[PDB]
Amino acid sequence: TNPPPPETSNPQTNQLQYLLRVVLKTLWKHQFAWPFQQPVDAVKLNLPDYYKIIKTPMDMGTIKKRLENNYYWNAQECIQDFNTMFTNCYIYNKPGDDIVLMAEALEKLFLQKINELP
Numbered sequence: 019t020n021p022p023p024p025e026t027s028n029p030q031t032n033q034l035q036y037l038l039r040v041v042l043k044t045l046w047k048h049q050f051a052w053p054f055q056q057p058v059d060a061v062k063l064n065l066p067d068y069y070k071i072i073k074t075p076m077d078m079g080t081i082k083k084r085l086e087n088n089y090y091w092n093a094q095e096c097i098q099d100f101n102t103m104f105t106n107c108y109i110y111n112k113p114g115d116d117i118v119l120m121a122e123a124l125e126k127l128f129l130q131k132i133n134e135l136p
């Protein structure tokens with residue numbers, strides 16, 4: 019069985035609104051977005067070692083749930099989750115894999131969207 023997804027509720031800056039409404043939304047509609055739209059389903063994908071290697075898992079779906087529930091206090095905490103998501107992919111998969119190239123293309127576009135923020 020897969021581990022439970024990361025918590026998405028803690029209990030509104032302009033940069034957080036921008037990350038959700040502009041950065042995340044554009045990356046969510048990118049063609050290479052599908053493997054990162056929800057937590058890695060290690061059971062269905064038959065990856066019994068994923069959650070042994072990746073100890074801080076993260077996906078765009080959990081970012082959205084966190085951005086919609088005001089989980090983050092600031093934009094830096096949210097930007098770290100994206101970097102957690104990208105670096106997780108680089109750690110588990112092998113260089114040259116198509117998913118690694120997809121993650122690189124997503125990150126390089128992510129740095130452009132955050133390169134112009136309030």
Ligand SMILES: COc1ccc(OC)c(/C=C/C(=O)c2cc(OC)c(OC)cc2CCNC(C)=O)c1
Pocket residue numbers: 052053054055056058063106107108110111115116117
């Ligand atoms: C029906 O097939 C489906 C349907 C829905 C899916 O997700 C919604 C997926 C997810 C596939 C992957 O995630 C995936 C894809 C790879 O190449 C394409 C890969 O190459 C080594 C390693 C992984 C393992 C995860 N590695 C990560 C996340 O970095 C597959």
Ligand SMILES: [Cl-]
Pocket residue numbers: 028088089090091
């Ligand atoms: Cl808060």
